[PDB]
């Protein structure tokens, strides 16, 4: 994985260059965004279980997905689904903190689509729940932090589709 600083450093290193003005401007942007990112990470950590249960209530409960024939039927599958959502929120928070999506490619999305397809986990419904996580999260961390989290939750969704 890389965070936003290592990403800019790597782009320079592979050219054998010191960081130029444009590169330093990218670092300045990330350094200045520190308070935003750290506060949002603290809020999400403190509210992680609530965010997931509210997202599930909005997007999945009382639907076909939780009835026999649906992929959340059986307590075992219900719990597995919740666990997935716990994962997506935690890893999106990592990526938001890092200002970089690489940890998502390396540790979330790698072979995930094939795993779901083999098991019959519905992509459409999963993406709907992640989108619900995005909106619940935004209601708590505010508009500006909500946008950053939205980038990385959207990233996971795009990677599944």
């Amino acid at each position: 994985m890389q965070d936003a600083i290592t990403a800019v450093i790597n782009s320079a290193d592979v050219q054998g260059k010191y960081l130029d003005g444009a590169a330093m401007d990218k670092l300045k942007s990330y350094f200045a965004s520190g308070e935003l990112r750290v506060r949002a990470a603290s809020v999400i950590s403190a509210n992680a279980a609530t965010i997931v249960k509210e997202a599930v209530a909005k997007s999945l409960l009382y639907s076909d997905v939780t009835r026999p024939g649906g992929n959340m039927y059986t307590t075992r599958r219900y719990a597995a689904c919740i666990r997935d959502l716990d994962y997506y929120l935690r890893y999106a928070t990592y990526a938001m903190l890092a200002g970089d999506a690489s940890i998502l490619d390396e540790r979330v999305l790698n072979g995930l689509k094939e795993t779901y397809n083999s098991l019959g986990v519905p992509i459409s419904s999963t993406v709907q729940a992640i989108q619900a996580i995005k909106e619940v999260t935004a209601s708590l961390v505010g508009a500006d932090a909500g946008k950053e989290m939205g980038v990385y939750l959207d990233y996971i969704c795009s990677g599944l589709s």
């Binding site: 965070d3 936003a4 600083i5 054998g16 010191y18 330093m24 520190g34 935690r90 990592y94 903190l97």
Partner: protein, 162 residues
């Protein structure tokens, strides 16, 4: 950087970063302006810094530019100066990242295997970075020199110890 370090530890423990870890990230990110000033000063003064350094290095080790020496002849000597500029550049990366990771992954893992294969004496490299440190820190404020010295020291210690 410091941020990815925290994230890797948290992920290893299947948890969010702790309040303590987040405080540490906050403190790191407010020190950005200083790190950028240091990086630009070293970049701007690369030629001057490398020149002072190489002058001291080959005063101590004239045998490196004598026949049979690894830096004998202009092409080889110029490649040494090239390497010097590269390690100065890696130090600026370390300062910006707040840790040794960008230095280690690009210029230290395998460094002994490389220079041994090139017949460049590793103790010569230890001596080289020592006087690079001297030259570079001399162009910084006292505060900035103290901030920067550990990144040189890490290189020097790495190249000294097996």
């Amino acid at each position: 950087s410091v941020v990815s370090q925290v994230i890797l530890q948290a992920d290893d423990q299947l948890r969010y970063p702790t309040s303590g870890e987040l405080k540490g990230i906050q403190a790191f990110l407010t020190t950005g302006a200083q790190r950028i000033r240091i990086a630009e000063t070293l970049a701007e003064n690369e030629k001057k810094i490398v020149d002072q350094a190489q002058k001291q290095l080959f005063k101590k080790h004239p045998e490196y530019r004598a026949p049979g020496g690894n830096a004998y002849g202009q092409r080889q000597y110029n490649q040494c100066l090239r390497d010097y500029g590269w390690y100065l550049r890696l130090v600026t990366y370390g300062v910006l990242a707040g840790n040794k990771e960008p230095i280690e992954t690009t210029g230290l893992i395998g460094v002994k295997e490389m220079y041994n294969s090139l017949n460049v004496p590793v103790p010569g490299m230890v001596d080289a970075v020592t006087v690079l440190k001297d030259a570079a820190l001399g162009l910084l404020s006292a505060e900035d020199a103290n901030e920067t010295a550990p990144y040189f020291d890490y290189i020097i210690q790495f190249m000294s110890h097996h």
